[PDB]
Design a protein around this ligand. Structure first.
Ligand SMILES: *[C@@H]1O[C@H](CO)[C@@H](O[C@@H]2O[C@H](CO)[C@@H](O)[C@H](O)[C@H]2NC(C)=O)[C@H](O)[C@H]1NC(C)=O
Ligand SMILES: *[C@@H]1O[C@H](CO)[C@@H](O[C@@H]2O[C@H](CO)[C@@H](O)[C@H](O)[C@H]2NC(C)=O)[C@H](O)[C@H]1NC(C)=O
Ligand SMILES: *[C@@H]1O[C@H](CO)[C@@H](O[C@@H]2O[C@H](CO)[C@@H](O)[C@H](O)[C@H]2NC(C)=O)[C@H](O)[C@H]1NC(C)=O
Ligand SMILES: *[C@@H]1O[C@H](CO)[C@@H](O[C@@H]2O[C@H](CO)[C@@H](O)[C@H](O)[C@H]2NC(C)=O)[C@H](O)[C@H]1NC(C)=O
Ligand SMILES: [Ca+2]
Ligand SMILES: [Ca+2]
Ligand SMILES: [Cl-]
Ligand SMILES: [Cl-]
Lengths: 471, 198, 198, 471
């Protein structure tokens, strides 16, 4: 239930926020697969509301389950699972199953939505199917947040057999189409009691896609829990992974300059984070990348952000997910638009970037280079820690790989790597192309002990090297 | 018994308790939700204030002011609430920006609420004043934007002569909504409190 | 910054910090050494009081009263001292019953001391009042037995404009002697404090 | 260094506060030995000041080391070690080695004492031999309490070779005479640094008394440490046992009614008490039995006090010491006096009590009966805990022994003892005399499960039974 599920020899996933289906497919086989990528957390695939101005948030008001979105209808979807899955790129659907809508009637696939009368025919769905109306008062009262309307949004009752039936059909339908997981939308607002029963009807993966016989669907959930509240993330642990939200804050604060990197030695459970294999960690996230001053690192502030996801990536804890957002200037501004439509994100020319409004974080040297780094070190515990007891950190994942960095103080140290004596093409700055390094060609003597030099003024604060970079 | 009081023209984490996404900027302002959504943060003065006295039955009349600047960056469920949360069953004046109501929510049951519009205050400074007379049992709240002079007030009779309350922990509880109600922030830069017995 | 104040006609462990043999009786009195000798006990108001402000350099003028009844049951080294102990280099007014001196001991170096006799107060209530003017830098102490009207006072210029002091933890530190100076007790039943900035 | 040292098959010691030497001898062989007693912490044996009114406290101002006290001269002392030690009753001298006197000149063995000029000829001792004068200001300043005059008492400098020399001679002298230990007076006021060097010159025990070849002198120290202070008991752990002072307070508060007996389950290190084998535990103590209201239990409040030392005794933690005080009405009133002299404490007639002003706690049924209980269970860890989750506690030290009690609620339970099926003569109330029980003749079925009945109104709250009480 908490198993990653990626095609072997590969590691971690990406959020291609709002991207089109057929587009995803291209990306799946053209960039994701060649780079040891886990998969993709596919933006909301089911019919949702057509909210005026068409903002990212409209995508979170289910009108129905009819698989026709702004990213495409089933044909393209089915196709997207068939290409993408063969490439090894696992697809992970965003399952919004706690409510429908809070406003009226325009469904993205012609289906209406009578908010007032609590009617969703596409389904169908009526008043009996919903919890009694009331709203989210105190996050100190457990059933209030779960059983009332989160933001005047019609709260479905996952307690009923009919409702459990429908949701189950939806997910399984997706499981039939290929998906291996579900980024459960807002688990905190749902009773874990039936959250399990729903996570049970889900029949084992579709054998015909490549999955290891009888393998269950990866289930990770959305639960913001930074203490205080009457709800805990642990309540949703006995049956699925949860999205660690402290990870972003703490580690984010850390690199933001709000904490000594020297403190990340005991990075892990000792920071109010669940068991390693229980979380899906991430830095920024589609939603909270909108918040802004402080703790959260988005691409808006690049440098420490890369060092951040790098520390993530390099570090073993939980399962990771990079985010490929689109440029934004408001907080509600929709992805690329034209009198109704999503504009493609060609990445062009090729420094392997992207154009016309899509940032493509994942295609950044620093970010992807490190993903393969992750693959390259698997099964290795935390080893060979180091610091200047301030803002210079360094270590390595066994004889398989090494990394270091600095917020302040030219780390012109003379360290170790604990690896085979040789040379290695750094991945941040550089990589190996045509049997020669495109950035830093360092040496490493006959026993790990190597010399490092990463200056403040440099483009970045981080240096990765691993056997799969050995020339 | 213990009558307590304090004036804070500029906050400092030293005499504060921070739960959730609660912090203090170099500019000396308490800040909640600045990095979070669909969650609740809180801050409380270190010293546990005393409301009811068990040695007489007596109750403290407290009085209190505080300036705050609520933002949404969008041109309770979502908002900032002053709370008398007991010591580790809560009287709470909530500035819910989402239901667009100001109310005295006691045990999830609002004793009195009145509408107010967030756009009359989003962005600027707002003066709040809570006051409770132990003698007349009259609770009262007042919101007022100094920049213009709009005041959404409210008032009600509340009985705190309940054996279960003695010692509370006066603070703030800024809750944050989901989806488009995820961006609201809550700055508080001034706060004064005052309990009294007779 | 933070100006704090409180009146305690009857103590309650709830808003107190107890180190060593420090407790609170049903009769609402703070009690130190009642079960110990050759040791030191302490009690501090929960809230960490602020003395110096780093945003201006300014210093708090604090003022404070407190009744206490020192016993020896025999018809600093041994006594009860009010202390401004920094947050986890200490200004301390000590009522040493053994050296029979009242003094303002700052960093083990008494800035001013004056003799007083314990027998003028052993057994009954004594009114102490500490006061420090931030403007004139004048510290001052006064002991007075209401039952008769004897007052052993003292006063001196003390400079707290030292960067290291900002936040302190106002409390009491009753120390207990050895052998025949093992039986002294220290009851405090009233205490009011008050810091101020301008 | 921290070894008890008692004659085998025996357990714990007593403080015969102020008793005479030859008197001790009688007690040593007439009552202590027959009852499995460890030994005696012998009141200050060396020449001290003759303070007017002759108060217990005078006994703590060394005029000299000349072995002539109000308890007797060397002849009787030597004798006291020779009788008492043969009886198995180990003697433990109170070593007052941090100061001399603070007042002037009257030494209990004709020796003068020039306080002013810092002169003690009996020794000799002069100014050079003392630390520089100053007094005990802040217990927050470490060298101040150690290096200044505790209560205007002339502070010796245990740092000098001459001074270390003298003290060493004193102790060893005692070691020659027979003693096995030293209740170091006020260790908190002495630098542990030379406290060790002094604890080293001490040559192994006098072979000729019975001691196991090359066995070092038991050293336990006086250090009041209930937190806060700049001095810690642990600073005197690496070379000797310390007198646990929290034990009395906590466990005292417990039985005083200030705490649920149910809480003593984790009684031990988890209460701010050092490793079991590091402390000498005790309830009241000669000094602190003078304090009064609250926490401390003295014979003045009997019932819970007995349950207290019983819990001590029964429980395994550290090494114990019962106290045999003398009745007092002031705080400075001297033991029995007559125009200069200590009146004997005959115990008469014989319910085995004592007369003419001496309480003799140790001869109390409840107290001594439990000492043998202790002997009887040695080597047994804590086992079979029980409670009414309030003020009724019960357990047992292996198949060797059992105990229970109550502050509130007639423990008419039906419990276990985890011992051989049989009958047992309780020791608190009763014992076995002439093959029949003098108080409670309980039964215990074929597997520990026994029935208990201890009522509130009873004389005491406690019931002990052990194989050495099996009839
Ligand atoms: C709040 O007060 C704290 C504690 O005094 C200040 O933190 C200190 O800042 C001073 C001056 O720069 C430094 O010397 C100390 O090392 C700091 N101590 C700690 C514990 O942080 C802080 O500057 C104050 N904040 C505001 C906004 O005034
Ligand atoms: C909160 O502010 C209010 C309003 O200013 C204070 O009430 C006034 O205090 C001022 C200044 O001393 C007086 O001039 C007025 O007479 C007071 N009443 C009114 C209705 O204005 C109040 O003292 C403050 N409370 C706290 C706890 O700081
Ligand atoms: C100090 O206040 C405390 C906390 O309110 C009081 O402790 C309570 O006593 C009440 C009334 O008997 C009980 O209902 C509670 O169970 C107690 N709570 C706790 C945490 O102890 C206490 O009585 C007060 N002490 C004095 C001297 O007034
Ligand atoms: C401590 O008590 C003193 C003396 O009573 C207080 O000083 C006086 O307050 C009274 C009552 O308001 C006034 O009538 C006097 O004018 C004040 N000064 C003097 C010299 O008596 C003082 O307010 C108290 N301090 C605290 C912190 O409670
Ligand atoms: Ca719900
Ligand atoms: Ca000394
Ligand atoms: Cl997410
Ligand atoms: Cl002792």
């Amino acid at each position: 239930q908490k198993d990653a599920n990626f095609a072997s020899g590969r590691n971690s996933i990406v959020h291609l926020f709002e991207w089109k289906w057929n587009d995803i497919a291209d990306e799946c086989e053209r960039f994701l697969q060649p780079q040891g990528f886990g998969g993709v957390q596919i933006s909301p695939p089911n019919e949702y509301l057509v909210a005026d101005g068409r903002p990212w948030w409209e995508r979170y008001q289910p009108v129905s389950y009819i698989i026709n979105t702004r990213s495409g209808n089933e044909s393209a979807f089915t196709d997207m699972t068939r290409r993408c899955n063969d490439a090894g790129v696992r697809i992970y659907v965003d399952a919004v199953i706690n409510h429908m809508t809070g406003m009226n009637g325009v469904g993205t696939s012609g289906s209406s939505a009578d908010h007032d009368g609590m009617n969703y025919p596409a389904v169908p769905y009526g008043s009996g199917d919903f919890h009694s109306p009331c709203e989210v008062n105190n996050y100190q009262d457990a059933d209030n947040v779960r059983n009332c309307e989160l933001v005047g949004l019609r709260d479905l009752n996952a307690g009923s057999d009919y409702v459990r039936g429908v949701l189950i059909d939806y997910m399984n339908h997706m499981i039939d189409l290929g998906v291996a997981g579900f980024r459960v939308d807002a688990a905190k607002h749902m009773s874990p009691g039936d959250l399990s029963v729903i996570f049970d009807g889900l029949k084992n993966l579709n054998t015909d896609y490549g999955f290891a016989d009888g393998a269950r669907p990866f289930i990770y959930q959305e639960v913001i829990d930074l203490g205080g509240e009457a709800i805990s993330k642990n309540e949703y642990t006995g049956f699925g992974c949860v999205l660690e939200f402290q990870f972003g804050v703490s580690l984010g604060n850390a690199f933001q300059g709000g904490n000594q990197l020297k403190n990340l030695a005991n990075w892990g459970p000792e920071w109010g984070l669940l068991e390693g294999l229980d979380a899906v960690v991430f830095v920024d996230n589609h939603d909270n990348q909108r918040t802004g001053g402080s703790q959260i690192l988005t691409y808006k502030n690049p440098k420490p952000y890369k060092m951040a996801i790098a520390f993530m990536l390099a570090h073993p804890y939980g399962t990771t997910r990079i985010m490929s957002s689109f440029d934004f200037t408001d907080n509600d501004q929709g992805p690329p638009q034209d009198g109704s439509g999503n504009l493609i994100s060609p990445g062009i020319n090729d420094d392997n970037t992207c154009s016309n409004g899509y940032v493509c974080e994942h295609r950044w040297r620093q970010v992807y280079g490190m993903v393969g780094f992750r693959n390259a070190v698997e099964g290795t515990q935390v080893e060979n820690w180091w610091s200047n007891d301030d803002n210079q950190i360094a270590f390595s994942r066994g004889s398989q790989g090494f990394v270091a960095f600095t917020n302040g103080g030219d780390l012109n140290q003379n360290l170790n790597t604990g690896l085979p004596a040789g040379t290695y093409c750094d991945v941040i700055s550089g990589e190996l192309s045509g049997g020669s390094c495109t950035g830093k060609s360092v040496t490493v003597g006959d026993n790990g002990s190597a010399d490092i030099s990463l200056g403040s003024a440099e483009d970045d604060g981080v240096l990765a090297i691993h056997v799969n970079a050995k020339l | 018994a213990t009558e307590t009081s304090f004036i804070i023209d500029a906050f400092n984490k030293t005499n504060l308790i921070l739960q959730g996404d609660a912090t203090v900027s170099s500019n000396g302002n308490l800040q909640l939700s600045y990095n979070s959504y669909d969650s609740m943060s809180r801050a409380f003065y270190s010293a546990p204030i005393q409301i009811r006295d068990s040695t007489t039955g007596n109750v403290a009349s407290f009085d209190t002011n505080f300036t705050m600047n609520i933002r949404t960056h969008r041109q309770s469920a979502v908002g900032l609430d002053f709370v008398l949360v007991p010591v580790q069953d809560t009287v709470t004046v909530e500035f819910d920006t989402f239901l667009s109501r100001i109310s005295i929510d006691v045990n999830n049951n609002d004793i009195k609420s009145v509408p107010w519009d967030v756009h009359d205050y989003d962005g600027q400074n707002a003066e709040v004043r809570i006051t409770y007379n132990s003698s007349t049992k009259v609770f009262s709240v007042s919101l007022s934007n100094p920049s213009t002079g709009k005041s959404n007030n409210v008032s009600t009779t509340v009985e705190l002569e309940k054996e279960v309350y003695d010692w509370v922990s006066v603070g703030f509880s800024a809750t944050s909504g989901a989806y488009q109600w995820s961006y609201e922030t809550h700055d508080v830069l001034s706060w004064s409190f005052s309990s009294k017995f007779i």
